Design a protein around this ligand. Structure first.
Ligand SMILES: [Zn+2]
Lengths: 317, 145, 123, 68, 95
């Protein structure tokens, strides 16, 4: 039983030591620095970003006619993989069908998309040019053809933001004259831990900020070598009237931990690369769903909610 | 066919044993508690109410348990109801010289259940007798081994 | 009182043998009949050549002299004691892997036993 | 067969990022670096639309309903 | 059954093993971190029997003064306050 007396929890001191800065934010990508947070909370934020927060995806697929080349289960799978733009909290969860299975759809739970394309021959083509985009009409079954079908109330629920596919240019299948695809996909809410197609954010991960410090200042042509080792920008050759050339670490955030120097025979004395233990550099690139701001906010929201859940179910006992 | 033990821990477990028993490894409170608990896993195996630990090998200015201290902690928390502590001295596999000319690891020596000196390897626990796991099988009986 | 050593020491050699962390140091002192070689955390407590010691091996670490003194504190059993070459005792204290070796001519090194220690090194 | 939508390691979508990759080698005289203009910085999502065999365009020329 | 106390709990409720279902390291690790900031706790480490079945064995040993249930309660409140601070600073950052 030994506590070290400096590990005391204190919300004021923690909140004061914590610092956040947002390097860049776009409609898709977001890169920002958290600091003053122990590793496990960073692991938790990453996990909730990838796994735990919900987002609609195509679960069921009812094919009415499919004579295409693509296997039917493959086509259902690949349709399921496409992403859909709808704020996943506008819906409820799907109560999964135990025995007594049929009557398990409602307008708040699931949304339906439908497509159908029959590739018919295009006769205007002069010669043989198997594009095939020009030889045949409706040749490539795109994603953008998955045209949503409103189910009752929904037509006015999402009138401001139509429930559409995220990327109208994804390829779903390919056809030639004669065959047809016709199906409707039932989309429900999902939790990424069960299947990957639910996970809103594609790529969310962090780096511990590297630290480069020069023990002994290098000189001359070695300054060129040292600038050359790390990628551009992070190593400047100082304009010093004393002597001729040195090198100092401008801004390491761009650098990768690549550890190229330590292989050199002469440099190994002069530089170490360490890691600021409480500076965390998140990067989050969305897929098609939501502004990454809402992603991170809702992620810490989800942690709060799961903690509330365990708190209450404990309070029962 | 002979007496030597045929079971044992294997590849990842043994080289990570050489990395945990090594004296260069230090753990704080959080990692030590977590690791000891992951090693024991009481409830599913059972038999115990509350786990008992050892004091930290080095204490000031930061409390840092050492690895051999953790192997000793395990050896303790599997101690039978009332059986006197283990003691053993036997040669390890990794010869000491790899560590240092005249390094002391060499041969695992632990009295009263505490890895005083000597890192664990194939010989200490594996397909080699007169190590840890074999003497534990002798003293404490097989259902403990 | 159960203090077992209060000798002063000075460092003579330090390595640093394939360990970025803890490094053995040798600190013979007294009238040179004190062959002290120990291990220390060379990451959180630096020790260099001729850095003076204040070494105290107690038994029960309950006193304000703990906080006042003891700028570095260890713990561990002492497994082997021998009388070798003379009326000369060599003691070997383990510290959870970290080892020790201290030699005296059976004097100033009297009460050393086969128990736990709580070494205290105050620079 | 068709391009593996949602590349394996990462989660980026690359379905639509082949028919616009192919008409870069086709008519831009560029090398394999062409895909860098598409917004693929990693090398997991880059070994997908680079070294993928589009083995459907060789398979769709097998309709039994050829009518010929 | 979200949280159920496994049958090894000492009568004093000083060494209890919470078992949170449908959870993995995601909450276990951070909760352990927040709990270890609490001085009156002696031992707090989390495990998983088998990752296939989503059951997280928790475990807390406490000081005789306060039982472990109150420790877990305060730890969860503290984790919630941590998320509160994070969301506060974050939503301050952008417009
Ligand atoms: Zn990828």
């Amino acid at each position: 039983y030994y506590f070290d007396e400096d590990n005391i929890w204190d919300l004021d001191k923690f909140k004061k030591n914590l610092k956040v800065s947002i390097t860049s934010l776009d409609q898709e990508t977001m890169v920002f620095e958290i600091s003053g947070i122990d590793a496990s909370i960073a692991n938790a934020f990453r996990r909730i970003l990838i796994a735990e927060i919900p987002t609609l995806a195509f679960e069921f697929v009812y094919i009415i006619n499919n004579t295409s080349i693509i296997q039917d289960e493959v086509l259902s799978h690949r349709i399921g993989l496409v992403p859909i733009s709808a704020d996943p909290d506008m819906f409820k969860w799907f109560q999964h069908p135990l025995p007594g299975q049929e009557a398990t759809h409602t307008d708040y739970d699931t949304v339906v998309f439908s497509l159908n394309k029959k590739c018919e021959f295009n006769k205007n083509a002069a010669t043989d040019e198997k594009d095939p985009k020009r030889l045949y009409v409706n040749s490539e079954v795109y994603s953008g053809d998955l045209i949503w079908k409103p189910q009752g109330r929904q037509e006015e629920r999402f009138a401001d933001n139509p429930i559409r596919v995220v990327n109208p240019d994804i390829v779903v299948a390919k056809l030639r004259p004669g065959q047809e695809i016709d199906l409707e996909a039932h989309a429900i809410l999902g939790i990424g831990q069960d299947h990957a197609k639910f996970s809103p954010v594609a790529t969310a991960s962090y780096r511990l900020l590297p630290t480069i410090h020069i023990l002994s200042p290098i000189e001359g042509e070695d300054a060129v070598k040292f600038q050359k080792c790390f990628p551009k920008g992070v190593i400047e050759l100082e304009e010093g009237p004393d002597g001729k050339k040195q090198a100092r670490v401008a801004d390491v955030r761009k650098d990768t931990v690549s550890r190229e120097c330590l292989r050199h025979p002469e440099f190994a004395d002069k530089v170490q690369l360490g890691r600021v233990r409480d500076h965390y550099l998140f990067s989050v690139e969305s897929t098609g769903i939501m502004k990454p701001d809402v992603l991170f906010i809702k992620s810490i929201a989800v942690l709060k909610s799961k903690c509330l859940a365990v708190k209450s179910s404990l309070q029962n006992i | 066919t002979s007496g030597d033990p045929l079971r044992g821990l294997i590849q990842d477990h043994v080289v990570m044993g050489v990395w945990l028993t090594c004296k260069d490894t230090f753990y704080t409170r959080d990692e030590y508690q977590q690791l000891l608990f992951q090693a024991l896993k009481p409830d599913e195996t059972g038999m115990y109410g509350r786990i008992k630990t050892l004091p930290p090998a080095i204490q000031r200015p930061g409390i840092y348990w050492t690895g051999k201290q953790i192997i000793s902690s395990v050896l303790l928390n599997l101690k039978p109801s009332d059986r006197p502590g283990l003691n053993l001295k036997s040669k390890a596999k990794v010869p000491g010289k790899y560590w240092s000319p005249d390094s002391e690891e060499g041969s695992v020596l632990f009295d009263d259940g505490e890895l005083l000196c000597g890192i664990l390897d194939k010989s200490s626990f594996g397909a080699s007798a007169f190590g840890l796991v074999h003497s534990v099988h002798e003293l404490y009986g097989p259902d403990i081994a | 009182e159960s203090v077992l050593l209060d000798e002063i020491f000075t460092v003579t050699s330090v390595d640093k043998q394939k360990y970025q962390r803890v490094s053995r140091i040798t600190a013979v002192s007294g009238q040179n009949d004190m062959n002290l070689t120990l291990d220390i955390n060379s990451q959180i407590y630096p020790l260099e050549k001729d850095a003076t010691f204040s070494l105290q091996i107690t038994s029960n670490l309950n006193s304000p002299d703990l906080k006042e003194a003891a700028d570095y504190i260890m713990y561990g059993k002492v497994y082997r004691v021998e009388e070798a070459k003379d009326e000369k005792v060599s003691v070997y204290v383990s510290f959870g892997g970290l080892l020790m070796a201290i030699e005296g001519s059976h004097r100033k090194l009297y009460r050393l036993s086969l128990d736990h220690v709580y070494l205290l090194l105050r620079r | 067969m068709i391009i593996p939508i949602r590349c394996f390691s990462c989660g980026k979508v690359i379905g639509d990022k082949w028919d616009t990759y192919l008409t870069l080698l086709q008519e831009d005289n560029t090398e394999g670096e062409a895909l860098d203009k598409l917004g693929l910085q990693r090398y997991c999502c880059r070994r997908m639309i680079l070294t993928h065999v589009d083995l459907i365009e060789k398979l769709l020329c097998y309709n039994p309903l050829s009518k010929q | 059954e979200k949280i159920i106390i496994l049958p090894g709990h000492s009568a004093d409720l000083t060494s209890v093993t919470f078992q949170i279902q449908k959870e993995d390291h995601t909450l276990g690790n951070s909760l352990r971190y927040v709990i270890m900031k609490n001085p009156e706790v002696e031992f707090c480490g989390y495990s998983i029997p088998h990752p296939s079945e989503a059951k997280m064995n928790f475990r807390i040993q406490t000081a005789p003064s306060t039982t472990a249930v109150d420790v877990l309660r305060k730890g969860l409140d503290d984790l919630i306050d941590l998320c509160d601070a994070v969301t506060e600073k974050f939503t301050e950052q952008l417009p």
